[PDB]
Design a protein around this ligand. Structure first.
Ligand code: MET
Ligand code: ZN
Length: 345
């Protein structure tokens, strides 16, 4: 039996084993190749699942253990993409990254994560949440040397995502999450076509869908950026009204230690809300009570049966020890509030 009230989850990614990849980095090269890597990825999935279960996470992910990066791995499996043709581009309208190049017409040929999801589905009866990159974030994490159009390419990616997502649903995934950190930047594009591309990505799915929009991984570039954002981070106000009208079921957001006004959650009243109650941009471990405090504040704007305690973003850049402490705090804080709501203490 699954957790009916305040079920916990994370944004998706968790640290990989030392023998599989370099610690505490983004885009780590794989330390195994060939059949050893095939086995290692699945063993890492099993170990990550166990870590999530031990920490009391109710809705589990792959720990993103089988991918190098939450955006570029998916892109690299597509036709029309040159994996080893790298360019430095400014991503998120702000900072530089080494990204793959679109060299021709894009298409999905073989499935990407479906065999992984079938494998994970056999390991547990708990709900499974699998993240894919959203169409906008995809076009913002590559160099387009063919379409020469963010919108045209994003449309093609929406179609491809829909194919992958539908097959992940067939594999038994319960929640398909689309990672759209780009939505906290490109407001005009979100309004003109980003929502439409997200709708195309989710068309015909019967499982629950989520969109994740945050202020990024725990890296210096982002913590520096946060220091410039002022007293109120109101980026969500630009996109929440349209997300409210969309067919997305769950909105995953950053909240803990942020300056996002909590009353912005009223704009999505009726949606399920994955409320980030863990700051993945500090190594300081939250107390259970600090997590509980964020969840209590969120209950002013979200019905208890729609509140999904979560992390502000993924944890692949953190150490295993920090991650363990944070996930334990998340589950412990959720339980504090769950017990209050049920008059158990
Ligand atoms: C910068 S958005 C990253 C989201 C991704 N699903 C993760 O958990 O890492
Ligand atoms: Zn994020």
């Amino acid at each position: 039996l699954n957790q009916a009230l305040l079920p916990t989850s994370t944004a998706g990614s968790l640290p990989k084993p030392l023998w599989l990849a370099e610690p505490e980095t983004l885009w780590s090269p794989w330390k195994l190749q060939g059949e050893e890597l095939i086995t290692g990825k699945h063993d890492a999935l099993r170990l990550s699942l166990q870590d999530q279960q031990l920490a009391g996470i109710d809705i589990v992910s792959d720990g993103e253990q089988t991918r190098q990066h939450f955006v570029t791995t998916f892109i690299e499996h597509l036709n029309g993409v040159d994996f080893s043709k790298r360019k430095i581009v400014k991503i998120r309208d702000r900072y530089d990254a080494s990204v793959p190049t679109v060299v021709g017409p894009v298409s999905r040929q073989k499935s990407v994560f479906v065999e992984d999801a079938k494998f994970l589905r056999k390991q547990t009866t708990q709900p499974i949440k699998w993240a894919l990159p959203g169409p906008m974030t995809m076009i913002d994490t590559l160099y387009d040397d063919h379409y020469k159009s963010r919108e045209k390419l994003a449309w093609e990616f929406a179609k491809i995502l829909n194919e992958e997502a539908k097959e992940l649903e067939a594999a038994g995934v319960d929640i398909i999450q689309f990672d759209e950190p780009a939505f906290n930047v490109f407001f005009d594009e979100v309004n003109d076509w980003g929502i439409a591309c997200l709708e195309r990505a989710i068309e015909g799915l019967k499982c629950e869908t989520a969109v994740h929009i945050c202020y990024g991984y725990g890296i210096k570039a982002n913590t520096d950026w946060k220091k410039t954002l002022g007293s109120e981070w109101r980026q969500y106000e630009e996109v929440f009204p349209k997300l409210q009208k969309s067919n997305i079921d769950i909105i995953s957001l950053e909240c803990h230690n942020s300056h996002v006004p909590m009353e912005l959650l009223e704009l999505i009243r009726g949606k399920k809300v994955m409320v980030g109650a863990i700051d993945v941009a500090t190594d300081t471990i939250e107390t259970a009570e600090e997590v509980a405090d964020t969840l209590r504040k969120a209950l002013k704007f979200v019905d208890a049966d729609k509140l999904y305690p979560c992390t502000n973003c993924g944890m692949t850049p953190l150490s295993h020890q920090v991650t363990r402490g944070k996930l334990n705090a998340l589950s412990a804080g959720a339980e504090i509030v769950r017990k209050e709501l049920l008059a158990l203490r």
